[PDB]
Design a protein around this ligand. Structure first.
Ligand SMILES: [Zn+2]
Ligand SMILES: [Zn+2]
Lengths: 63, 145
């Protein structure tokens, strides 16, 4: 269950744990340095981007 | 050599794709030697198909380059081993990986889509084209390792 969780908070671009995660309305997130959604291709306004401090804390309480 | 490639490679060797052997070249880590087993209940069944995959400079922004080495009678693989697969071109995304490519090529073997001369044969007389593919598999894709 811990591997599945770590994979949920893994940036699909750099393949490392999310660093300054920025989330899309589709639910997918990326490292701030790492940015249509690259994953699901659902379009987004280049301002509907919002940082996800909750995920950032989950990433830290992981390893 | 970007850490992304190191991670993918490490991860690919850890959890291999079922029916697919994929290993980095001993001299050039950007090159992968790939062997895909012919899918069961397909004309390519019993076959082991060799492919070369390499990661260009701009990967993952650019798609990996793949080419069949083993001769194969498939509507979507030309005489030069070049494969028609959308994610190898305009449908490529940085969120995609080597795994997805391997999985897609593997699926392409299970579902040849004729809709080149090879494609013509699969279209006009499918039953015979399958028989040719079955012969090509025996001839070129068996005992070839
Ligand atoms: Zn990243
Ligand atoms: Zn998405």
């Amino acid at each position: 269950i811990l591997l599945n969780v770590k994979e949920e908070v893994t940036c699909p671009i750099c393949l490392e744990l999310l660093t300054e995660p920025l989330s899309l309305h589709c639910g997918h997130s990326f490292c701030q340095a790492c940015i249509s959604c690259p994953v699901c291709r659902i379009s987004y306004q280049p301002e509907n981007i919002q940082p996800n401090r909750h995920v950032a804390n989950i990433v830290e309480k992981l390893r | 050599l970007p850490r992304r490639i190191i991670k993918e490679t490490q991860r690919l060797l850890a959890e291999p794709v079922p029916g697919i052997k994929a290993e980095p070249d001993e001299s050039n880590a950007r090159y992968f030697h790939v062997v895909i087993a012919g899918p069961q209940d397909s004309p390519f069944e019993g076959g082991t198909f060799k492919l070369e995959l390499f990661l260009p400079e701009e990967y993952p922004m650019a798609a990996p380059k793949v080419r069949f080495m083993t001769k194969i009678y498939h509507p979507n693989v030309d005489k030069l081993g070049r494969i028609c697969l959308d994610i190898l071109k305009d449908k490529w995304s940085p969120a995609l990986q080597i795994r997805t490519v391997l999985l897609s090529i593997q699926a392409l073997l299970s579902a040849p889509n004729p809709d080149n001369d090879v494609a013509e044969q699969w279209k006009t007389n499918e039953a015979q084209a399958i028989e040719t593919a079955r012969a090509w598999t025996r001839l070129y894709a068996m005992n070839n390792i």
